[PDB]
Structures are given as structure tokens and as C-alpha cells.
Amino acid sequence: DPLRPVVDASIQPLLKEHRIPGMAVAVLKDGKAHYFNYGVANRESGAGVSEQTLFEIGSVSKTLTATLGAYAVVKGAMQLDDKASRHAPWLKGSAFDSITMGELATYSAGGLPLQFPEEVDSSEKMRAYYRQWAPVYSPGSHRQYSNPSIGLFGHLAASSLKQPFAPLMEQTLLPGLGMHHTYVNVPKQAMASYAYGYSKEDKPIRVNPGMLADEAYGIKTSSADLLRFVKANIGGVDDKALQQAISLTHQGHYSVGGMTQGLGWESYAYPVTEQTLLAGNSAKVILEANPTAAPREQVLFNKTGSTNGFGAYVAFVPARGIGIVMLANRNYPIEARIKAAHAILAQLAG
């Protein structure tokens, strides 16, 4: 593959530096998909990684959940300006009577935390949590990355469509995106393709159960399926409704520095410097609260994602028809993901 030398040049050093057991890389250029596979999906057995290997993608799941929400909007089942309680009777009489679906989707509801408190481990406790939650900031004023925030958005989006989230995604949305091997719950026939994640101590692990995990960070997919998603975000899909939904996830709602927050996807003016990309994906933007600013007025879209044993990254530029997917079974530094992707994308762009 003429592109192997280029991809290898940025990926190989990464694998060695962070002792990554395996990584599936997929690139899109001139309409064609290119696959580069490294290492193993299972260290004990030695099973090799392929573009069909299933990896946990963590927060990258939010781009798919966001697409489901956009789909609900297109179908007329809900509007982003809808108060959250309009789609959950159990939220009536809480702070969510004055918070919108869009604010939940863009982490700007007012300070919902990164993760649910450790004690919130059941449906009953989760409902109680939201009903007692007190806003920290006025709605729309600050961005505080939050799983409970986007998780609730996805949960309610599914409810607006009158179907449970998991089956809705697996039986309708994902198939519509051409993603037939993407799961919230990996089925029996696909378990053999499911890689094992590896902690810092090299222990084989997989994602732990959690409230709204399916909506916020529970997707398992392959580099082939995720690149098909990238293609859908560029070349489009056959279904008009789904196409409209995809476009909605490209719209900027507000910005934080050089990063513009949309539904799921986070975008930047293209060409973008490695410095700007690193900043938008820095700990300051990820962990702390930051005031929202007016949205950006070519564009690169991206999203990072991790689980205790996995590290994923996806970035693409529609106007140039290029994109890259990097799925690894080691949660290695986000900065390393950005640097490798930026280098490869630069070569692909010309």
C-alpha cells in the first residue's frame, strides 16, 4: 500500500512508546478506505488485530448518540430547544424543567459533573440524583464535559422515538449508517472478534457497567465500521432523514478557544495547527468548566474516546475528503493520538 510507509511512520513509534498491544487504523482518501493493522487483540492467545476487530471506543460513542438525537429532531419527535422534562415525566419538578435537550447534548446545562457520583448505580438512584441536582451555572453559560449530561440527552432522545436506546441504535440507526458490526451489547456471534483491553498493569479488561453507559461511552465497533461512519459524514447516506441528521451534528453551537462544540462532534477551522488541536483536547477543556463563546463563523471534525483498557480517536475533513480512525486496546495519552493523526492527515491532504 503506497500509504503504508506514511501511516507506519506515525503509528509504529506510538505503539512502541506506549506498549500498545494492538491498533486498528483506517484512513479515507479519494473515496477509498485503507486499513493498517498492528499487533494483537488478545495478548494471551496472540489473535491479531484486523479491521473487523471490535474495540471499545468510549466517548466516541457520543457522536453516534448525537446522531440519534439529530435523527429524532429530523423525525419531529423532539426539538433541541425542548425542555428536558418534556421527554421524561420523572424530571418534572426539577431543574430540568428549565434546561434544554441541546444544552444536555453540548454539556452546557449548568455544571453536571464528568461522571455520576459513585453511589448512583441504579435506575432509582439515577432518577433521584437528577431530581436533586442543583445547577452550578446558568444554562448555556459554561461547558463542563459530562457523561450524565450527554447520557441523559441520548436516553431521552430514544424515549422521544418510543424505543429503548440499545435496540434503536442496533436495529435502526447503525444499520442505516451502514454499520452492521457496531454494538451497545456485543452479541454471541461477534464475541470472538471483541478485543480485550489492557490496563497500565497489562491486565485484560473490558468496560464496566454504569448508568447511561450505553448512551455515553458503551459502543464497541471496528475500524471498518467507524470509517464507514466517517464516510457517511462526508459522502453521505441513502436515507434522506439520516442525511439531514448527520448534517445537524456538524452545526456549531458555541466555542471554547479554537474548538467549536456541536452535537457529539467537536470542530476546528481547517487547516488546524497541532497546537490548536491539542488545546481543544486538553485536560483544561476536558476536565474543567469553561465559559462558552460564539461559534466559529474548511472544517475538521474530531472526537476522542477511552475506557480503562482502550484508546480511540477519529478525525476527518469533509472538504478534503480525508479521515482517520485509530482504535487501540490501551488507553494511551490523548496528546499522542492527536499528534499522530495530525501528521497522517497532513500527508493525506497534500
The answer for residues whose C-beta is within 8 angstroms of residue 242's C-beta and 6 or more apart is: 67, 71, 74, 173, 176, 177
Please report, in range form, the residues annotated as the binding site for AMP. Answer: 59, 145, 306
CB of 142 to Zn ion, least distance (A): 6
Positions touching Zn ion (CB under 5 A) are 1, 8, 18, 34, 180, 185, 291, 332, 350
CB of 282 to Zn ion, least distance (A): 17
Cβ closer to Zn ion: 21 or 265? Answer: 21
Cβ closer to Zn ion: 198 or 301? Answer: 198
Distance CA 171, CA 66 (A): 17
The answer for residues whose C-beta is within 8 angstroms of residue 91's C-beta and 6 or more apart is: 84, 85, 97, 130, 131
CB of 247 to Zn ion, least distance (A): 27
Residue 80 phi, psi dihedral angles, 5° rounding: -65, -30
Active site residue 10: no
Task: For the chain, state the CA radius of gyration.
Answer: 19
The answer for residues whose C-beta is within 8 angstroms of residue 192's C-beta and 6 or more apart is: none
Please report, in range form, the residues annotated as the binding site. Answer: 59, 115, 145, 304, 306, 331
Which of 45, 50, 59, 123 is catalytic? The answer is 59
CB of 214 to Zn ion, least distance (A): 6
CB of 56 to Zn ion, least distance (A): 13
Amino acid identity of 89?
A: P
Cis amide prior to 164 (ω within 30 degrees): no
Cβ closer to Zn ion: 18 or 43? Answer: 18
Distance CA 119, CA 257 (A): 34
Assigned C-alpha cell, 199:
490496563
Distance CA 21, CA 198 (A): 8
Cβ-closest position to Zn ion: 8
Is residue 117 classed as helix, strand or coil in its secondary structure? Answer: coil
Cβ closer to Zn ion: 155 or 248? Answer: 155
Q: How many residues does the chain have?
A: 350
CB of 12 to Zn ion, least distance (A): 7
How far is residue 214 from each of residues 158, 170, 273, measured CA to CA in Å?
A: 12, 11, 33
Please report, in range form, the residues annotated as the binding site for GMP. Answer: 59, 115, 145, 304, 306, 331
**Three-point CA angle 318, 217, 240, nearest 5°:** 40
Cβ closer to Zn ion: 34 or 228? Answer: 34
Cβ closer to Zn ion: 102 or 154? Answer: 154
Residues marked active site are found at 59
